[PDB]
Structures are given as C-alpha cells and as structure tokens.
Amino acid sequence: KIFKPEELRQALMPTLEALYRQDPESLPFRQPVDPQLLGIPDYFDIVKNPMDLSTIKRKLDTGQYQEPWQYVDDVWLMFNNAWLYNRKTSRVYKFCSKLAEVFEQEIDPVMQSL
Ligand SMILES: CCOc1ccc(C(C)=O)cc1NC(=O)c1ccc(OCCN2CC=NCC2)c(C(=O)OC)c1
C-alpha cells in the first residue's frame, strides 16, 4: 500500500494536535530540547536522537513519512527519550506518561481507518 503525504497528514495530524492540546503536559515537548537554555548540558550525552512535537509536525508537513508506523515511531522516540533522560518523579517524566496515554487512545482508531 502507498500512503500519499496528504492522506497521512489528514489522518495523523489530528493525533499530533491532540498531544499539543494537553496543558500542562505538552509544554516541554512543543519545541526541541535546548540543553544550554534549560541548564541540562548532559542531555545530548544521553539522548542521541532527539525528537519533539514540532519536528514531527514538520515531517508530516514536508512528506517525510512514507508509512504510518514511521510517524508512530517518532512519537514513541519522543516519549522514550523523555523517560530515558528524566527522573521518574520529574514533571517531564509524568507529563510524558500522560501524553503516551493520550496518544495510544488517539492513534488506535486512526490506524484502523488507514
Ligand atoms: C529544565 C528542564 O526542562 C526539561 C527537561 C527535559 C525535557 C525533555 C523533553 O526531556 C524538557 C524540559 N523542558 C522544556 O523543554 C520546557 C521548555 C519550555 C517550556 O515552556 C515554554 C515557554 N512558555 C512557558 C512560559 N511562558 C510562556 C512560554 C516548558 C514548560 O513550560 O513546561 C512546564 C518546558
């Protein structure tokens, strides 16, 4: 099956917007982690493949995904980076867990429809 870029955008962008809409939980994920600004210079020593909502959105807008599972992989890369880097008591870690719950719920019916 070939998935056209606009088909993927129409189906998958609403699932990304569902993550963006989460407040407070999406706020640390709306832009790439800037380790200098945030005062966490060890970040890139631990997270080798950074990912965030704005990068995923740009990839959808520029047709960088051929298959739905590639989009899902990037969302999960974002989650796994945050669970890897952050302590389990931290805001970012617990916010990540909430976003993963939202995403699981949103992506399932969409995948059925694709
Ligand atoms: C200090 C440690 O922070 C982090 C550590 C790890 C990670 C990840 C993904 O692993 C992320 C962060 N945090 C951030 O990236 C971050 C970035 C910007 C934020 O807000 C943006 C601005 N707005 C809020 C203030 N006024 C208006 C506009 C936030 C935030 O607000 O989270 C609650 C977090």
What CATH number does the domain containing 10 carry? 1.20.920.10
**Residue 28 Cα, ligand 1 centroid: separation in angstroms?**
4
CA dihedral 74, 54, 85, 65 (to 10 degrees): 10
What DSSP string describes 7-47? HHHHHHHHHHHHHHT-TTTTGGGSS---HHHHT-TTHHHH-
Residue 114 to residue 106: CA distance in whole angstroms: 13
Residue 6 to residue 98: CA distance in whole angstroms: 28
Ligand 1 within 6 A of 46 CB?
Answer: no
Residue 56 to residue 74: CA distance in whole angstroms: 7
- Token readout for 62 is 């520029």
Ligand 1 within 6 A of 27 CB?
Answer: yes
**Residue 32 Cα, ligand 1 centroid: separation in angstroms?**
10
Residues 22-36 as b or e (16 or more Cβ within 10 Å = b): beebbebbeeebeee
Ligand 1 within 6 A of 86 CB?
Answer: yes
Segments forming the whole domain that contains residue 3: 1-114
Total domain count, the chain = 1
**Residue 104 Cα, ligand 1 centroid: separation in angstroms?**
23
> What's the alpha-carbon Rg for the chain, to the nearest Å?
14
Count the Cβ atoms, other than its own, within 10 Å of residue 59: 16
To test the pocket of ligand 1, the residue of 26, 33, 49, 75 to mutate (highest count of ligand atoms within 8 Å of its CB) is: 33
Technique behind the model: X-ray
Residue ranges in 34-90 assigned as alpha helix (H): 35-38, 43-46, 53-61, 68-85
Residue 55 to residue 58: CA distance in whole angstroms: 5
- Contact indicator for 15, 103 with CB cutoff of 8 Å: yes
Residue 27 to residue 30: CA distance in whole angstroms: 6
